[PDB]
Amino acid sequence: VNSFSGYLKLTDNVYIKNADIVEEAKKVKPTVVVNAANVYLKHGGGVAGALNKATNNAMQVESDDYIATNGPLKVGGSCVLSGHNLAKHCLHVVGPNVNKGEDIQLLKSAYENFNQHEVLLAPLLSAGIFGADPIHSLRVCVDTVRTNVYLAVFDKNLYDKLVSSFL
Numbered sequence: 059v060n061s062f063s064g065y066l067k068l069t070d071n072v073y074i075k076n077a078d079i080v081e082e083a084k085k086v087k088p089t090v091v092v093n094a095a096n097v098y099l100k101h102g103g104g105v106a107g108a109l110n111k112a113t114n115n116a117m118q119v120e121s122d123d124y125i126a127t128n129g130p131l132k133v134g135g136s137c138v139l140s141g142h143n144l145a146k147h148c149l150h151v152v153g154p155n156v157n158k159g160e161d162i163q164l165l166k167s168a169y170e171n172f173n174q175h176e177v178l179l180a181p182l183l184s185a186g187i188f189g190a191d192p193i194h195s196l197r198v199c200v201d202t203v204r205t206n207v208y209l210a211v212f213d214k215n216l217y218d219k220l221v222s223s224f225l
């Protein structure tokens with residue numbers, strides 16, 4: 059039993075809710091919140107910009123030190139950093155950005171990072187300003203993640219389309 063509330067159950071391990079991941083994280087304080095990151099951990103917009111703003115830019119400060127030490131992430135890769143005031147840990151995961159011409163096949167690799175954590179609060183990788191089809195992203199999530207994932211979908215219209223079109 060966990061403290062996630064109001065989710066629809068899609069499969070044995072995947073749950074979904076129309077919610078702002080920032081407000082969700084601030085309520086649940088999960089062990090892991092997933093950020094929709096880029097390789098430079100520059101959290102300017104989308105989910106990343108929102109999560110960082112909620113940390114008063116502490117996420118960006120930590121991230122800049124991480125990059126200065128380690129260099130950029132790989133597309134499809136991840137790193138574990140602090141969750142600041144939102145969660146214990148933030149798993150920064152880089153899904154392919156279609157608007158950069160990146161290979162959508164790497165979305166499966168991105169979701170594989172979730173399997174290293176027993177429970178996660180997460181957005182739909184490569185959706186939003188990353189340009190991928192969210193219905194496809196949800197499909198890959200369900201077919202790749204085996205640990206317990208709670209998906210927060212910001213847009214109510216999109217949330218209704220993902221449920222009603224889910225196979």
Ligand SMILES: CN(CC1(O)CCOCC1)c1ncnc2[nH]ccc12
Binds near residue numbers: 077078108186
């Ligand atoms: C922008 N996205 C990503 C999508 O959910 C949007 C619709 O398409 C699927 C991915 C966010 N998701 C959850 N919480 C959020 N808080 C602020 C932004 C945000």
Ligand SMILES: [Cl-]
Binds near residue numbers: 103106185188
């Ligand atoms: Cl985003």
